[PDB]
Amino acid sequence: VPIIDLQQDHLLIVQQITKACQDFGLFQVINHGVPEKLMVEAMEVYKEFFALPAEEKEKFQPKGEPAKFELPLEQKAKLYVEGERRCNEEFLYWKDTLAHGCYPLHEELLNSWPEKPPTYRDVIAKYSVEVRKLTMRILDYICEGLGLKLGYFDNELTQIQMLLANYYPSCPDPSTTIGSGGHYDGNLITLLQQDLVGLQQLIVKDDKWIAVEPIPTAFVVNLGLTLKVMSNEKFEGSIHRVVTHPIRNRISIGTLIGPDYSCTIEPIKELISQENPPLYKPYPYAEFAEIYLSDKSDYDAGVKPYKINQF
Ligand SMILES: O=C(O)CCC(=O)C(=O)O
Ligand code: NA
Ligand code: NI
Numbered sequence: 001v002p003i004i005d006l007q008q009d010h011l012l013i014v015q016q017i018t019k020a021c022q023d024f025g026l027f028q029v030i031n032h033g034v035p036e037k038l039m040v041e042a043m044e045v046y047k048e049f050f051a052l053p054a055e056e057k058e059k060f061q062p063k064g065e066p067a068k069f070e071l072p073l074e075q076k077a078k079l080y081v082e083g084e085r086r087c088n089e090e091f092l093y094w095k096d097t098l099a100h101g102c103y104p105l106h107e108e109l110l111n112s113w114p115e116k117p118p119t120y121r122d123v124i125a126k127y128s129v130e131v132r133k134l135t136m137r138i139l140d141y142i143c144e145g146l147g148l149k150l151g152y153f154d155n156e157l158t159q160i161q162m163l164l165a166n167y168y169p170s171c172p173d174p175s176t177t178i179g180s181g182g183h184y185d186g187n188l189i190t191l192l193q194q195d196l197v198g199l200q201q202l203i204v205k206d207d208k209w210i211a212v213e214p215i216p217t218a219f220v221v222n223l224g225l226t227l228k229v230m231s232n233e234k235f236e237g238s239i240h241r242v243v244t245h246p247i248r249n250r251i252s253i254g255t256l257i258g259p260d261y262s263c264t265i266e267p268i269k270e271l272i273s274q275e276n277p278p279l280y281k282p283y284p285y286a287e288f289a290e291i292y293l294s295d296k297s298d299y300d301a302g303v304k305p306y307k308i309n310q311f
């Protein structure tokens with residue numbers, strides 16, 4: 001798993017990011033310019049949030065129950081559950097996610113965010129601005145690696161910025177060791193902050209799941225299915241999963257950037273050529289999203305209906 005220092009020479013960064021995108025669809029970045037103090041404060045906010053009493057968490061349960069990952073995927077803050085498991089043949093546990101949009105930060109959106117812990121809005125608004133800035137920088141390195149003009153993705157293709165704070169209860173003897181099953185992210189690009197082992201990447205060419213080392217001040221970058229399609233498979237998407245920790249409750253902070261639901265997705269036209277014919281026909285992001293969220297029969301079930309020029 002490449003670890004890319006963003007204070008190296010510009011051209012080296014472009015070259016290393018491009019190779020990682022071609023080879024794996026996942027890499028880590030260090031010396032990335034986001035304040036370490038802000039990364040630590042954001043993790044502390046989520047530790048404090050997930051430790052709040054059940055009565056506080058009811059504020060994020062629409063109509064009194066957790067949300068599910070199904071359309072419409074709203075931007076107002078909600079608690080989501082998934083993946084029920086049995087621990088020690090005794091207690092049930094699940095994967096909890098607090099998720100909300102971040103951009104644009106409309107007053108109506110901000111007022112859906114937690115107000116306890118009391119530093120939530122200040123810390124997480126600052127965090128979201130910094131992580132978006134880093135994401136857009138990485139997308140520009142990707143533009144240069146693909147041969148596209150800088151700023152290609154600075155439009156409706158990055159209109160949605162979802163923050164997903166995941167909480168994985170520990171279990172030493174779980175019904176299943178996987179707390180989050182293997183998936184591609186459906187969006188364009190994701191930045192993930194972690195501080196505890198559990199994230200693994202599927203090396204498809206080697207049919208092997210390998211650890212993504214936790215570096216608490218780094219960001220893990222993983223390319224989503226939308227970028228796999230837009231790059232016409234010149235870049236890989238990342239298939240990744242999370243293993244429940246035996247001892248510690250694990251928290252990760254994901255920033256998932258991607259298109260609006262009114263967007264049409266297709267391979268970037270300027271890169272298509274006679275020897276690089278399009279491998280997907282254009283499709284509505286919202287129709288893709290419905291399939292992506294519903295059909296788990298294959299990792300790329302969401303885009304299978306749109307594949308073309310298959311040989
Ligand atoms: O918890 C993690 O490290 C991964 C989270 C993830 O893959 C997701 O939310 O899409
Ligand atoms: Na625990
Ligand atoms: Ni993911």
Ligand SMILES: [Sr+2]
Pocket residue numbers: 058061064065066
């Ligand atoms: Sr409830």
Ligand SMILES: [Sr+2]
Pocket residue numbers: 205206207208
């Ligand atoms: Sr092998």
